[PDB]
RNA sequence: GUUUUCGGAACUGAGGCCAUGAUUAAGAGGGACGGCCGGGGGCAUUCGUAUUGCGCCGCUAGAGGUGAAAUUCUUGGACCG
């Protein structure tokens, strides 16, 4: 918890993978390589209602919790790596990333380079469902 | 009583004469030639993510899914990286 780094002159970088879908949000922060984690909280950690766990407020609360964890641990700067569901399902990010980014910026956590890293397919396998789709 | 004018017809050779003898190349068709064009066809080769499973590492109690839930998988480490 104690380290010989310079606070005023420079800063410490990590990366944070924000995976947001239409069912859940994932605010995961690691080191610069991504091999070694820092803290991982999700939209199920803050709200116990299973209706809206991909809600913006749950993602906001999880982002404030992981920002407090990185502040008490000693991480000052973050590189945002945004992610959707990917694959053959969808490409639009979920309704938690917009609140999660603003909650990460509002807490005093400095933001470096932001990027969308989602799995894009070059015509992968068949999507779940019939030929006529899911009729509702 | 020979052999003639008393004469009915197939075939071949030499020369001359013919206005010597073949209508066109269809905004018909076929074919040749030259420069190309094309997710046209067959065979071989090569690449790109994505999906699933498995191996290892890290921290965590939820993850998936729905209009809403459960069946489903989870401290024997799920999900995410």
UniProtKB/Swiss-Prot annotation:
Keywords: Cytoplasm, Isopeptide bond, Nucleus, Phosphoprotein, Ribonucleoprotein, Ribosomal protein, Ubl conjugation
Organism domain of life: Eukaryota
Location of Phosphoserine modifications: 1, 124
Transmembrane regions listed in the UniProt entry: none
Comp. bias intervals (Basic residues): 127-136
Subcellular locations according to the entry: Cytoplasm; Nucleus, Nucleolus
GO CC annotations, alphabetized: cytoplasm; nucleolus; small ribosomal subunit
HAMAP family: Ribosomal_uS11 (MF_01310)
Family per similarity comment: Belongs to the universal ribosomal protein uS11 family.
UniProt subunit comment: Component of the small ribosomal subunit. Part of the small subunit (SSU) processome, composed of more than 70 proteins and the RNA chaperone small nucleolar RNA (snoRNA) U3.
Family matches, as PANTHER family: 40S RIBOSOMAL PROTEIN S14/30S RIBOSOMAL PROTEIN S11
Official protein name in the record: Small ribosomal subunit protein uS11
Primary gene name: RPS14
